[PDB]
Design a binder for these strands. Structure first.
Ligand SMILES: Nc1ncnc2c1ncn2[C@@H]1O[C@H](COP(=O)(O)OP(=O)(O)OP(=O)(O)O)[C@@H](O)[C@H]1O
Ligand SMILES: Nc1ncnc2c1ncn2[C@@H]1O[C@H](COP(=O)(O)OP(=O)(O)OP(=O)(O)O)[C@@H](O)[C@H]1O
Ligand code: NA
Ligand code: NA
Lengths: 220, 228, 50, 224
RNA sequence: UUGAGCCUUGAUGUGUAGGAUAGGUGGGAGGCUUUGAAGUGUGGACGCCAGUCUGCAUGGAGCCGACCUUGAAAUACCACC
């Protein structure tokens, strides 16, 4: 059906325009869903080399569309600040080992040096799917209030595959085509600024914006 | 391709091998021969980079994970059967041993918070979530069943100690330098299992065995190290 | 002839070296001597490296 | 070719081993049960099997550092046993020179010769008789063990796996030394044309049936 | 006829613990099924020989996903390779 009609309706060989593609993605509208669309950029890097990995984040003016349980698992000043800053819980070891198994999961996890219990409380399951606090990502910092403020402001994080293609949360289809621009360009600018100095050759070749249920198109 | 550039080593008061230089690279298997007491294992250590020569340079490959087998099949007797294989990969084993200083140190500092935050991330990059998942399956593939995975290495017959020490080198392995692989002499069934394993997979290898028939059936070159 | 030539490179950071001779086959062992280093104008330690 | 020659301190006559029942076990059902056999001052009886059968632990029980669950082994009252272990790391330790290690043996010998001479008969010089014992490599350590056996001069050589790290030029030197040796020995080497070279009383060992003494072991492999 | 490089398409891929031959990257829980199904009979090829797999009419429109032993989550799909 859709997989056999959209294939002939939209051609991925021709490189579309930003304005045409943002409209076409919303124009597909085959199945009914929240339609949380995303992107995929083919970075020119050697992910084989450890230093050319690009794990980072950027604060977006549209966030992700949903709030998570961004709590600071470090008892003390950071946890006290986060509790009033609007986390999902407080920082304690009752939910790290005795509750780390019973409790299913949260959205995010920040850390502080006051009680670095979360460094082992997650163990293998808590951060096995990407829940550990990145020291370079800023999650594990003393400023629990600042971390909670950034999490409320909507700092979206991105990583790399084993070949160097970045895909990450960018926003829902409920945000208009005009609003898509200050998300796409903001993410691209942040990635360009944070690009490693050891990036030989052309480091951006192909941007493809895709739907959760639909396909993807070559934007530029 | 790893290259030796005028390598000399002087043990005692007379040079062992004088100003050697040769190129290793490709899907070939440079088995090397030499009388005991004359280079061989020392040259293998130089190539691996564990020991530096008195003159010359290793001219190492950039990050191609030299995977090695040692001469001693009894040097591992306290680390368990499932511990040796996971310790084969350096950057994983070192990070694991350092991260093991969390549950054993009841005091954490501000810098230590950053360090525990980033070492777990490095562990995730190095696949610590599957570090023990990728080891038991290889250990079963070589022919070591489950019942002795967590048992100590001491309670293993040496013909299987070698079977596990070989698997210790099988973690994303180009450029495997195998020291004396026989000794603790394999039956011959284990020897043919070895030869099929070695000559089926494609990589650059350096054998040092003394078995003429095994070397005939395996290797294509002979990097003899005899006179100087 | 039999005594080879060696240079004691200074350990004060500057590029300076005294050159002497050493019997190179009794045992490999670098020479450590405290010799004057004119560039820094002090008596520093001199480790050998040819 | 390292010139190695095994002498005999005192010649025993009647018979040496005379073992009745061992039944040694570690974790599973005993690797063997009876193994009743005699020696009669013979030669070898090249114990052999597959990897993990328990030939090394059988030799351990015979040499007495491990005792069976219940049984008797006993040796002749004049029996002097030289032992070459499968793994020898408890020996090359305590940071001695080659000279000191080789001199810690010997019965009544001058410090300068008959101990610095047995070293030179097997590929060692003045520049090597001062390097530490714990640094030699493989075949050199095995050769040092051979030298200690040559100086101890034992009647019965247990010699677990002698051909491990040898040169393929020391292998036949040891072969000739063993076939010219006039004492009693056992050995569990897995080599084909070593057992085929000199074995007479070959004893195979299996989890169920322990065969013994077909002959040259060529007739053994022919009957099998 | 046999190599090497590229484009496109189609096949292609377990454990230790299983209802199951799970590549990650995590986006998500509701799509997928009738531009004819659930399952039935017909076999190609591959096959850590258990199974995937696709030409095929008829039979006519249920299945899947979630929970779940688990290091991981499931051809609920898609993009990136
Ligand atoms: N650290 C050392 N210091 C001094 N001499 C050494 C050292 N290591 C080894 N030797 C000696 O120098 C030579 C180098 O030994 P090496 O380990 O290279 O032997 P090898 O040829 O690999 O032997 P084998 O065939 O038995 O494995 C040997 O003769 C040894 O006795
Ligand atoms: N200390 C021990 N504890 C438990 N099991 C042991 C112990 N020592 C040996 N075994 C077991 O006994 C069997 C034989 O051990 P042994 O060391 O005698 O081997 P082998 O047959 O001589 O083989 P190889 O010399 O080639 O290693 C093996 O199954 C081994 O796991
Ligand atoms: Na060696
Ligand atoms: Na043995």
């Amino acid at each position: 059906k859709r997989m056999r009609v959209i294939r002939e309706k939209v051609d991925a060989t021709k490189q579309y325009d930003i304005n045409e593609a943002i409209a076409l993605l919303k124009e597909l509208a085959t199945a009914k869903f929240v339609e949380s669309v995303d992107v995929a950029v083919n970075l020119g890097i050697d992910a084989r080399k450890s230093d050319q990995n690009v794990r980072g984040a950027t604060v977006l003016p549209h966030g992700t569309g949903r709030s998570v349980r961004v709590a600071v698992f470090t008892q003390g000043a950071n946890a006290e600040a986060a509790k009033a800053a609007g986390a999902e819980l407080v920082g304690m070891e009752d939910l790290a080992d005795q509750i780390k198994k019973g409790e299913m999961n949260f959205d995010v996890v920040i850390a502080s040096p006051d009680a670095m219990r979360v460094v082992g409380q997650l163990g293998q399951v808590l951060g096995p799917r990407g829940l550990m606090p990145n020291p370079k990502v800023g999650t594990v910092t003393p400023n629990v209030a600042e971390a909670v403020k950034n999490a409320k402001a909507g700092q979206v994080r991105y990583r790399n595959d084993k070949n160097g293609i970045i895909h990450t949360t960018i926003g829902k289809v409920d945000f208009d085509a005009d609003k898509l621009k200050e998300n796409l360009e903001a993410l691209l600018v942040a990635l360009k600024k944070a690009k490693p100095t050891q990036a030989k050759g052309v480091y951006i070749k192909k941007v493809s914006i895709s739907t959760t249920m639909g396909a993807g198109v070559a934007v530029d | 391709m790893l290259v030796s550039s005028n390598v000399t080593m002087q043990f005692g008061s007379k040079p062992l091998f004088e100003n050697i230089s040769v190129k290793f690279g490709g899907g070939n298997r440079y088995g090397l021969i030499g009388a005991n007491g004359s280079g061989k294992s020392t040259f293998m250590k130089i190539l691996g980079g564990d020991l530096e020569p008195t003159l010359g340079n290793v001219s190492l490959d950039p990050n191609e994970r030299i995977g090695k087998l040692r001469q001693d099949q009894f040097a591992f007797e306290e680390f368990t059967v499932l511990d040796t294989v996971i310790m084969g990969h350096k950057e994983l084993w070192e990070v694991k041993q350092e991260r093991d200083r969390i549950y054993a140190l009841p005091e954490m500092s501000e810098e230590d918070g950053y360090k525990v935050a980033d070492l777990e991330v490095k562990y995730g990059e190095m696949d610590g979530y599957s570090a023990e998942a990728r080891a038991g399956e290889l250990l079963l593939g070589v022919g070591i069943p489950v019942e002795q995975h967590y048992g100590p290495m001491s309670e293993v017959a040496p013909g299987w100690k070698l079977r596990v020490l070989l698997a210790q080198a099988l973690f994303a392995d180009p450029d495997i330098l195998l020291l004396d692989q026989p000794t603790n002499n394999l039956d011959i069934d284990t020897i043919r299992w070895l030869e099929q394993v070695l000559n089926e997979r494609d990589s650059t290898m350096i054998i040092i065995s003394h078995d003429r028939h095994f070397l005939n059936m395996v290797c294509t070159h002979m990097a003899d190290l005899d006179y100087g | 002839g039999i005594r080879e030539k060696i240079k004691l490179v200074s350990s004060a950071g500057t590029g300076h070296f005294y050159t002497t001779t050493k019997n190179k086959r009794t045992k490999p062992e670098k020479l450590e001597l405290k010799k004057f280093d004119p560039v820094v104008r002090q008596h520093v330690i001199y480790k050998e490296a040819k | 070719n390292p010139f190695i020659r095994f002498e005999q301190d005192k010649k025993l006559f009647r018979n040496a081993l005379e073992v009745e029942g061992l039944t040694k076990g570690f974790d599973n059902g005993p690797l063997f049960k009876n193994l009743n056999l005699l020696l009669e001052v013979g030669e070898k009886l090249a114990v052999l099997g597959t990897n993990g059968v328990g030939k090394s632990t059988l030799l351990k029980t015979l040499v007495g550092d491990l005792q069976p669950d219940s049984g008797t082994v006993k040796w002749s009252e004049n029996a002097r046993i030289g032992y070459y272990a499968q793994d020898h790391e408890y020996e090359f330790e305590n940071d001695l020179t080659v000279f000191e290690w080789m001199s810690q043996w010997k019965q009544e010998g001058d410090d300068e010769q008959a101990v610095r001479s047995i070293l030179g008969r097997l590929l060692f010089s003045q520049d090597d008789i001062k390097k530490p014992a714990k640094v030699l490599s493989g075949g050199e350590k095995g050769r040092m063990l051979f030298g200690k056996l040559m100086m101890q001069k034992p009647n019965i050589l247990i010699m677990d796996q002698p051909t491990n790290h040898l040169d393929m030029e020391s292998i036949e030197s040891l072969n000739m030394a063993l076939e010219l040796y006039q004492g009693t020995l056992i050995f569990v080497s897995h080599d084909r044309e070593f057992v085929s070279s000199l074995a007479t009383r070959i004893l195979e060992i299996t989890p169920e049936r322990v065969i013994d003494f077909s002959g040259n072991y060529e007739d053994y492999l022919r009957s099998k």
